[PDB]
């Protein structure tokens, strides 16, 4: 029985995880107190993917909460679903990292990593057949990035055969909230490229653009961003929980999407999104979902796919629909946009179909792309990195905690090598 | 428990402390006698926030404050005032003469025999504290006590505690206005301690605050009470991130991680945007864009220096009240397109943002209008060099003839602590000039290998 | 300088003798012929290499190559290159249970010793013989293994931890906290070699009783100094001698692996597959820019896909002179595998290195300017202007 | 009798040698190109 251990780090990861546990909990029908009050018989069939079973017919999510500032933990406990989590999994300390990756990875997090790994081992030992992990955190921050990278390294050291997923929120061109985001982002990306099987890219700029242009909201908050992201996470792993005409495990996505080991940075997307005003106009059907999934403005990474090529894509549909229509639409998308797909991967579109849609919708779809345009994002960070590293803008904070220029240099070189490895396949006309 | 210990030195320090503690008592619903009837009316809570106040068994709340001065007058005004029962009876006041606008008198002769008691009480306060974040030292350049005793206390604290942050709020001498003939000497002699030992020093000017009061609040005849209240608002905006919940919380370490590129350039300016009278509170929207733009106006600066003559090195915005991230993002985006505001080429991000839900409070008898939104900006720039240079000139005009020097040497110093300080000022100005220069053109001179 | 290529065929073992023992490999001069056992009508496909070696029969003289023969031909040449001041490498290749341990290490108790002992002994003899008042020599040793994408040190005492691979900005990849031991005599380095061979991870399979389970890299850092109180520069030359023994590719059906022995093999195959790509990639690039026009626009080599290719970034290409020794199996049943090795060997000679090796760039600039001054002064003197 | 002290400067021998050799190379090249020998 496949099931997932869940880890949350930092403020962004903690909040996204809280919202995610509210969404999954609806689909499966779980009371905030922990009891089950569903209506369908298929909600409890595979509930063990996320939830352990307690004595009194309760269900406890298999989540791990990590931070160095206690305050966020309180915000989780004093909330709509604060009592659902078991208190033993609230692992935290004091004197947070303060947006310093060195404190998160080397000085402060090195003490709390033992306790976090203890709780992770305790959860993973009880697993019937542990599939893999998934971590939510922010690369541009402090405790989140550092402790996420450290935990990822330790877990890959101890569990080499299991899947290691990751949902990362990285910096943006215009949206910036810390002065030292490039250093943290560069070091985090250097750590992630080695020790991770899948990494979904999320950008606040793309989510705000979706909210303003697609959903037409006027005053979006972080709740809406968490809503979209949690919808994506629930969309990714639908097939482990519910039956379908053609299933798609996590390993199937990993195999079909990753041509070479270092190219595992994905662009996610979700459909439909209708703004609550145009819901009565559009007809809902497979062609509409196909059109919305591949639209450039619907992506969550703020990287235009038209500036590169799609190495691979995966489409996970939820709902009762015909397979012939899905296959025809995917073939049409391949054929019409002939110049945005690579010429040495015939039929580079993975397809999955699940028969149980979300509770309020007749149809839905999730899109996981893998394209060269992601290089742009890395290039941007690299540019900013140089602009601070050449003069050593803030390096004394990092070197005071037990680092040196050599780690910065090797991280920058690794990032540049990854950026070069994407471009290779980016240009057309492989001959000269 | 995000505990912070406040130290007040000199008359300016004690009066700013009076304003600050009035605002703190009003913020958390603490009465002047230390009781909090809010918990009794409600039933219980965490309203006795451990940042500033320590709760005893009987429901009383003692502030984490340390008042120091050499004159009995300034603190005897507090021992028999409205807040006489709030503070602990121990107030560390030497029943003798004062430093008398003399750095030497406050550092060497009379600063002794009072430093030991002060350090003992600071240790007693620190022992009660768990997870102490740092210190907040209030004083004033140009005074004997606030220069010499502050120097001695900072030196001893750096020796003892070391790794704890030590923020500084100080009143710099104005360019034209002054209240003493020997202000430049005392101001210059404190550079060694304000540089080597402090982690971040915030400077304010009385002329700038008087201009702000005259122009914005329409107060034609302000006194020091208004200035102290404005400074109290600034400090509360700084410290609110670790007392109340918010969308993005900024601790005192994120401050130093984001604002100071190098150890020797930790002198950021500060400013408060929605400084407006009650009558003018109407006829205005007071949106995020308006206050954020007003933070960058040279007229609103709290130090007499023009940011247009320098370059912005780092910025930290701290918002309070009904604010949302997207308005702040739009404000930063429209700010980045203005050519009058120049950032150093080696800090492309250039902004740190924090948001807190608690809106600012209104002190009865005050002059600031009640508002829904507010923002405090702290900006590390290179224009501050000008604020040193003028003062440096003044120092020379008195040291060429060795005027007023016999008072200083008659208390323990020699003339070399009077040059060493000048050379340190010169080196600091050279550093500030060097950091702001644009990167040399294609900083690897030029490049381009074969292909 | 192009990569040097040697190939060698071994005799029959027990597995070959029990099953069909039909030979397919023939050798003549520099030419190696392989014949398809399934298609005798087909062409006898053949490959021309820099060196080929026939170790099938010892009494006869049909180009028979003892250990000393291959050692003279490759290792002595590469050692002479090292004395001139060039970083140098010899690495083995092929399939499981062919010839790597025999060729590089050999049987210590027997006279048929591998390349590494003979290179070390000749190096020690040469440094001891050529010692002089002005000349002086120093040598240092290290020996590491790659087990499952993890580096371990053999010469050091028991260290359960795994070392960390790092990147110096100028000198490229290296292994941090690697026990670099100073040595002074042939007996001491021989003892280090014996301890290192003992410390390696070896397991038994159907294909070979002593199937290696981990790649191995043996590094010798050599320093050549010339002392003069007037003009000469001390530490005239520094060289790195790298002997690499790679675990060969395996097939699960014939190997009979299960459990851990399977998993190890999988990692080994991964570490080989990437390596093959790198070789192929490298070849095409150093074939293309050299022959096509000279464009040198951009070519990516997947060095980082494995730690083995990462550590040998300077060895497979760049700042070293490299030799590749391929091991063959004469068994007919092995044909479909054996030919594969030859194909990569046929591409291995296409690779071209770029090695110059200097030291103390301040001295480099000073020497360049002084030589320019001397040349210009000589020109002026010859033409009557000096 | 307060008098200007100036800065005592001791250049590196390596930089001095490099600069002198570069100047010598330039001078000798300008001599050789002049007599049409380059
Ligand atoms: C159809 C109808 O009458 O109401 C819809 C609706 O109007 C629309 C606009 C919904 C609505 O979504 C939003 O307004 C929204 C706002 C900010 C961020 C994200 C969404 C809806 O709120 C969202 C809500 O979604 C669900 O109920 C799904 O099951 C969703 N779960 C949750 O939203 C949820 C939130 C908190 C607690 C429990 C469940 C989900 C989505 C993917 C995977 C799993 C679950 C639905 C159907 C609707 C409303 C209520 C208007 C849409 O959202 C989703 C995810 O369905 C917007 O794009 C779709 C299109 C729908 O037509
Ligand atoms: N903003 C503000 N500044 C003040 C206040 N009181 C004093 N100052 C400043 O302090 C300077 C004088 O130095 P003081 O700090 O008063 O010196 P002291 O603390 O009394 O110590 P002694 O010189 O020994 O008496 C003046 O130039 C003022 O500008 C105040 O209440 N508010
Ligand atoms: N040319 C040869 N002459 C004599 N004996 C040989 C020859 N080649 C190999 N052998 C022996 O045959 C066996 C297999 O060789 P061996 O060198 O152990 O394979 P291998 O190269 O180590 N394969 P692996 O270690 O898994 O990468 C050993 O006992 C060798 O001593
Ligand atoms: N999507 C989303 N992003 C967030 C949220 N909170 C913070 N962030 C992002 O995270 C970054 C700050 O990282 P932070 O959470 O402070 O890292 P930490 O200090 O290690 O916990 C900012 O650039 C924000 O864009 C949130 O609720 N949702
Ligand atoms: Mg006084
Ligand atoms: Mg072997």
**CB–CB of A143/A181 below 8 Å?**
no
> How was it solved?
cryo-EM
| A314 CB within 6 A, ligand 4 | no
Give the 3-state secondary structure of residue B54. strand
Is position B449 within any domain?
A: no
> B414 and B339 share a domain?
no
Last residue of a domain, one of B238, B268, B298: B268
Interface probe for B, chosen from A79, A379, A393, A400 (most Cβ of B below 10 Å), is A393
Is C101 a known active-site residue? yes
3-state secondary structure D4-23: CCCCCCCCCHHHHHHHHHHH
Q: What resolution in angstroms does the PDB record give?
A: 3.2
Is position B446 within any domain?
A: no
Is position B450 within any domain?
A: no
Interface probe for A, chosen from B329, B431, B434 (most Cβ of A below 10 Å), is B329
Q: Are C297 and B450 an interchain contact pair (Cβ–Cβ within 8 Å)?
A: no
Angle at B104 between CA B98 and CA B109, to 5 degrees: 65
> B8 and B112 share a domain?
yes
Last residue of a domain, one of B210, B245, B268: B268
Selected residues 397-416 of chain A with any CB under 8 Å from a CB in chain C: 406, 409-410, 413-414
| A18 CB within 6 A, ligand 4 | no
CATH classification of the domain holding B412: 1.10.287.600
> B293 and B194 share a domain?
no
Among B55, B254, B290, B417, the one annotated catalytic: B254
* Phi/psi at A395 (5° precision): -70, -20
| A140 CB within 6 A, ligand 4 | yes
Nearest ligand by distance to the CA of A71 = 4
Q: List the residue whose alpha carbon is closest to atom 13 of ligand 4.
A: A141
CATH classification of the domain holding B26: 3.40.50.1440
Nearest ligand by distance to the CA of C197 = 6
H/E element, A329: helix A323-336
3-state secondary structure chain C: CECEEEEEECCCCHHHHHCCCCECEEEECCEEEECCCCCCCCCCCEEECCEEEECCCCCCCCCECCHHHHHHHHHHHHHHHHHCCCCEEEEEECECCCCHHHHHHECCCCCCECHHHHHHHHHHHHHHHCCCCCEEEEEEEEEEEECCCCEEECCCCCCCCCEEEEEECCCEEEEECCCCEECCCHHHHHHHHHHHHHHCCEECCCCCCCEECCEEEEEEEEEEEECCCCCCCCCCEEEEEEEEECCCECCHHHHCCCCHHHHHHHHHHHHHHHHHHHHHHHHHHHHHHHHCCCCCCCCCCCHHHCHHHHHCHHHHCCCCEEEEEEEECCEHHHHHHHHHHHHHHHHHCCCECCCCCCCCHHHHHHHHHHHHHHHHHHHHHHCCCC
Is C99 a known active-site residue? yes
- For residues A241 and A219, give the distance between their C-alpha atoms in angstroms, rounded to a whole number: 35
Can you name the residues that pair with C95 across neighbouring β-strands?
A: C249
Chain C CB within 8 Å of residue A337 CB = no
- For residues A88 and A57, give the distance between their C-alpha atoms in angstroms, rounded to a whole number: 19
| A225 CB within 6 A, ligand 4 | yes
Give the 3-state secondary structure of residue A252. helix
> B44 and B152 share a domain?
yes
Determine the residue of A210, A360, A363 to mutate for testing ligand 1's pocket, defined as the one with the most ligand atoms within 8 A of the Cβ atom. A360
A297-313 in b/e burial notation, b at 16+ Cβ within 10 A? ebbbbbbebeebbbbbb
Ligand 1 centroid to residue A360 C-alpha, Å: 7
Domain ranges of chain A: 2-259, 260-373, 374-431
Closest ligand 2 atom, residue B101 Cα? 23
Among C55, C94, C143, C245, the one annotated catalytic: C245
> B296 and B315 share a domain?
yes
CATH classification of the domain holding B312: 3.30.1330.20
User: For the domain A2-259, what is the CATH superfamily, name and number?
Assistant: Tubulin/FtsZ, GTPase domain (3.40.50.1440)
The position carrying tokens 């008359």 is: B11
Is position B419 within any domain?
A: yes
The tokens of A168 are what? 């990362």
> B243 and B390 share a domain?
no
Is position B408 within any domain?
A: yes
In terms of DSSP bridges, do strands C31-34 and B373-381 run parallel, antiparallel, or are they unpaired?
unpaired
Question: Which spans in A103-170 are helix H?
Answer: 109-125, 143-158
Determine the residue of A93, A100, A169 to mutate for testing ligand 4's pocket, defined as the one with the most ligand atoms within 8 A of the Cβ atom. A169
- For residues A68 and A143, give the distance between their C-alpha atoms in angstroms, rounded to a whole number: 7
> B165 and B312 share a domain?
no
Of the candidate CATH numbers 2.60.120.10, 3.30.1330.20, 2.70.70.10, 3.30.1130.10, the domain formed by A260-373 belongs to 3.30.1330.20
**CB–CB of C135/C232 below 8 Å?**
no
**CB–CB of B64/B6 below 8 Å?**
yes
User: For the domain A374-431, what is the CATH superfamily, name and number?
Assistant: Helix hairpin bin (1.10.287.600)
H/E element, A316: strand A310-319
As for how many domains chain B has, the answer is: 3
Selected residues 81-140 of chain C with any CB under 8 Å from a CB in chain A: none
> B56 and B189 share a domain?
yes
A366 burial (CB, 10 Å; 0-12 / 13-18 / 19+) is buried
- Residues at CB less than 6 angstroms from ligand 3: C 10-11, 13, 55, 96-102, 208, 210-212, 247-248, 327
A291 is in an annotated binding site: no
**CB–CB of C124/C187 below 8 Å?**
no
Distances (CA, A) of A162 to A9, A131, A198, C148, C326: 20, 6, 12, 16, 36
Is C248 a known active-site residue? yes
Q: List the residue whose alpha carbon is closest to atom 2 of ligand 3.
A: C10
Q: Are C302 and A260 an interchain contact pair (Cβ–Cβ within 8 Å)?
A: yes
CA atoms within 13 A on the CB side of C104: 26
> B298 and B228 share a domain?
no
> B130 and B246 share a domain?
yes
Which chain C residues are Cβ-neighbours of D37 within 8 angstroms? 379, 383, 385
Identify how many contiguous H helices and E strands chain B contains and give both numbers.
17, 11
Q: Can chain D be said to touch chain C, i.e. do they have 3 or more Cβ pairs within 8 angstroms?
A: yes
Q: Are C304 and A413 an interchain contact pair (Cβ–Cβ within 8 Å)?
A: no
- The parent domain of residue B70 ranges over 1-268
> B276 and B288 share a domain?
yes
**CB–CB of A109/A68 below 8 Å?**
yes
For residue A262, give the nearest of C169, C292, C304 by CB distance: C304
Is B254 a known active-site residue? yes
CA A309 to chain centre: 21
Q: Are C304 and A410 an interchain contact pair (Cβ–Cβ within 8 Å)?
A: no
The tokens of C226 are what? 């010339």
Closest-CA distance, A157 to chain C, in angstroms, reads: 10
| A318 CB within 6 A, ligand 1 | no
Chain A CB within 8 Å of residue B431 CB = no
Is position B448 within any domain?
A: no
> B220 and B306 share a domain?
no
Distances (CA, A) of C12 to C100, C202, C234, C245: 15, 22, 52, 22
Is C344 a known active-site residue? no
Last residue of a domain, one of B242, B268, B294: B268
């Amino acid at each position: 029985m496949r099931e997932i251990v869940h880890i949350q780090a930092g403020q962004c990861g903690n909040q996204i995880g809280a919202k995610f546990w509210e969404v999954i909990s609806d689909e499966h029908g779980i009371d905030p107190t922990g009891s089950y009050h569903g209506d369908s018989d298929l909600q409890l069939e595979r509930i063990n993917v996320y939830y352990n079973e307690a004595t009194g017919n309760k269900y406890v999510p298999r989540a791990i909460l990590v931070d160095l500032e206690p305050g966020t933990m309180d915000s989780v406990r004093s909330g709509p679903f604060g009592q659902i989590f078991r208190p033993d999994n609230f692992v935290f300390g004091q004197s947070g990292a303060g947006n310093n990756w060195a404190k998160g990875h080397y000085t402060e997090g090195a003490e709390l990593v033992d306790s976090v790994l203890d709780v992770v081992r305790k959860e993973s030992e009880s697993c019937d057949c542990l599939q893999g992990f998934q971590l939510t955190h922010s690369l541009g921050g402090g405790t989140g990035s550092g402790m996420g990278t450290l935990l990822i390294s330790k877990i890959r050291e101890e569990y080499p055969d299991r899947i290691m997923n990751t949902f990362s929120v990285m910096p943006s061109p215009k949206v910036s909230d810390t002065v030292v985001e490039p250093y943290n982002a560069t070091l985090s990306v250097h750590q992630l490229v080695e020790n991770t099987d899948e990494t979904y890219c999320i950008d606040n700029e793309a989510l705000y653009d979706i909210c303003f242009r697609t959903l037409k909201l006027t005053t979006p908050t972080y709740g809406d961003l968490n809503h979209l992201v949690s919808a994506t996470m629930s969309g990714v792993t639908t097939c482990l929980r519910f039956p379908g005409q053609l299933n798609a495990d996590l390993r199937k996505l990993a195999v079909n999407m990753v041509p070479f080991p270092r190219l595992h940075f994905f662009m996610p997307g979700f459909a439909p999104l209708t703004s609550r005003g145009s819901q009565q106009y559009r007809a809902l059907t497979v062609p509409e979902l196909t059109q919305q999934m591949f639209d450039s403005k619907n992506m969550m990474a703020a990287c235009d796919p038209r500036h590169g090529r799609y190495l691979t894509v995966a489409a996970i549909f939820r709902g009762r629909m015909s397979m012939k229509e899905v296959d025809e639409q995917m073939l049409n998308v391949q054929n019409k946009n002939s110049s945005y797909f690579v010429e040495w991967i015939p039929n580079n579109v993975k397809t999955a179909v699940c028969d149980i849609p979300p509770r309020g919708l007749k149809m839905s779809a999730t899109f996981i792309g893998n394209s060269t345009a992601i290089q742009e994002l890395f290039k941007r960070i690299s540019e900013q990195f140089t602009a601070m590293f050449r003069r050593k803008a803030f390096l004394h904070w990092y070197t005071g905690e037990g680092m040196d220029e050599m780690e910065f240099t090797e991280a920058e070189s690794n990032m540049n090598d990854l950026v070069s490895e994407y471009q290779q396949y980016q240009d057309a006309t492989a001959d000269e | 428990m995000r505990e912070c210990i406040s130290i007040h030195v000199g008359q300016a320090g004690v009066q700013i402390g009076n304003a600050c503690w009035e605002l703190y008592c009003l913020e958390h619903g603490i009465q002047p006698d230390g009781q909090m009837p809010s918990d009794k009316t409600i039933g219980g809570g965490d309203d006795s926030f451990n940042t500033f106040f320590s709760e005893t068994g009987a429901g009383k709340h003692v502030p984490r404050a340390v008042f120091v001065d050499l004159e009995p007058t300034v603190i005897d005004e507090v021992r028999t005032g409205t807040y006489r029962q709030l503070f602990h009876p121990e107030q560390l006041i030497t029943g003798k003469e004062d430093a008398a606008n003399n750095y030497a008198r406050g550092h060497y002769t009379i600063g002794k025999e009072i430093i030991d008691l002060v350090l003992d009480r600071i240790r007693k306060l620190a022992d009660q504290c768990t997870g102490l974040q740092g210190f907040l030292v209030f004083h004033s350049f140009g005074g004997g006590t606030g220069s010499g005793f502050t120097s001695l206390l900072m030196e001893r604290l750096s020796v003892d505690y070391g790794k704890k942050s030590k923020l500084e709020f100080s009143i710099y001498p104005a360019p034209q206005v002054s209240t003493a003939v020997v202000e430049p000497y005392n101001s210059i002699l404190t550079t060694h301690t304000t540089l080597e030992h402090s982690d971040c020093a915030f400077m304010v000017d009385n002329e700038a605050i008087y201009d702000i009061c005259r122009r914005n609040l329409d107060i034609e005849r302000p006194t020091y009470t208004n200035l102290n209240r404005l400074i109290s608002q600034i400090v509360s905006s700084i410290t609110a991130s670790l007392r109340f919940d918010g969308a993005l919380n900024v601790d005192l370490t994120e401050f130093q991680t984001n604002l100071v590129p190098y150890p020797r350039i930790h002198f950021p300016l500060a400013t408060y945007a929605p400084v407006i009278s009650a009558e003018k509170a109407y006829h205005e929207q007071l949106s995020v864009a308006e206050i954020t733009n007003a933070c960058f106006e040279p007229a609103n600066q709290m130090v007499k220096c023009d940011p247009r003559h320098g370059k912005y090195m780092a910025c930290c915005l701290l918002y309070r009240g009904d604010v949302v991230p997207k308005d702040v993002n739009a404000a930063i985006a429209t700010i980045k397109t203005k050519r009058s505001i120049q950032f150093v080429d080696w800090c492309p991000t250039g902004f740190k943002v924090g948001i807190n839900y608690q809106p600012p409070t209104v002190v009865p008898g005050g002059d600031l209008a009640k508002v829904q939104r507010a923002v405090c900006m702290l900006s590390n720039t290179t224009a501050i060099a000008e604020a040193w240079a003028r003062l440096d000139h003044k120092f020379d005009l008195m040291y060429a003839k060795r005027a007023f020097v016999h008072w200083y040497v008659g208390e323990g110093m020699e003339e070399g602590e009077f040059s060493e300080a000048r050379e340190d000022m010169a080196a600091l100005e050279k550093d500030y000039e060097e950091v702001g220069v644009d990167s040399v053109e294609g900083e690897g001179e030029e490049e381009g290998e074969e292909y | 300088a192009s990569v040097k290529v040697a190939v060698r065929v071994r005799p029959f073992n027990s597995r070959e003798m029990s099953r069909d023992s039909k030979c397919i490999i023939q050798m003549s001069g520099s030419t190696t012929t392989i014949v398809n056992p399934k298609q005798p009508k087909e062409t006898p496909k053949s490959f021309s290499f820099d060196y080929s070696y026939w170790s099938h029969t010892s009494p006869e003289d049909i180009n028979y190559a003892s250990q000393k023969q291959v050692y003279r031909d490759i290792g002595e040449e590469m050692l002479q290159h090292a004395f001139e001041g060039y970083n140098v490498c010899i690495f083995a290749y092929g399939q499981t249970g062919a010839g790597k341990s025999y060729t590089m290490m050999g049987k210590q108790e027997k006279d048929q010793q591998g390349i590494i002992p003979q290179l070390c002994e000749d190096l020690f003899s040469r440094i001891n013989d050529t010692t002089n008042d002005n000349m002086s020599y120093s040598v240092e040793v290290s020996y590491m293994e790659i087990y499952c994408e993890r580096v371990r040190d053999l010469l050091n005492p028991k260290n359960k931890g795994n070392l960390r691979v790092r990147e110096h900005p100028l000198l490229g990849p290296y292994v941090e906290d690697l026990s670099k031991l100073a040595v002074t005599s042939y007996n001491d380095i021989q003892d280090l070699m014996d301890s290192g061979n003992k410390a390696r991870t070896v397991a038994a399979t159907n294909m070979n009783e002593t199937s290696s389970r981990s790649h191995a890299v043996f590094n010798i850092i050599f320093t050549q100094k010339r002392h003069d109180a007037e003009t000469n520069i001390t530490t005239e030359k520094v060289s790195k001698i790298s002997l690499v023994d790679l675990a060969g590719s395996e097939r699960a059906d014939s190997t009979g692996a299960k459990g851990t022995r399977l998993k190890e093999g999988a990692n080994i195959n991964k570490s080989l597959t990437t390596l093959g790509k790198v070789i192929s990639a490298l070849a095409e690039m150093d074939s293309g820019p050299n022959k096509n026009k000279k464009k040198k626009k951009t070519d990516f080599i997947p060095y980082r896909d494995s730690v083995l290719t990462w550590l040998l970034r300077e060895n497979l290409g760049g700042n070293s002179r490299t030799a590749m020794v391929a091991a063959l199996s004469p068994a007919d049943i092995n044909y479909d595998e054996t030919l594969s090795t030859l194909r990569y060997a046929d591409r291995a000679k296409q690779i071209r290195c770029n090695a110059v090796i200097n030291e103390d760039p301040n001295n480099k600039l000073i020497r360049e300017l002084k030589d320019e001054v001397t040349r210009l002064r000589d020109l002026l003197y010859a033409q009557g202007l000096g």
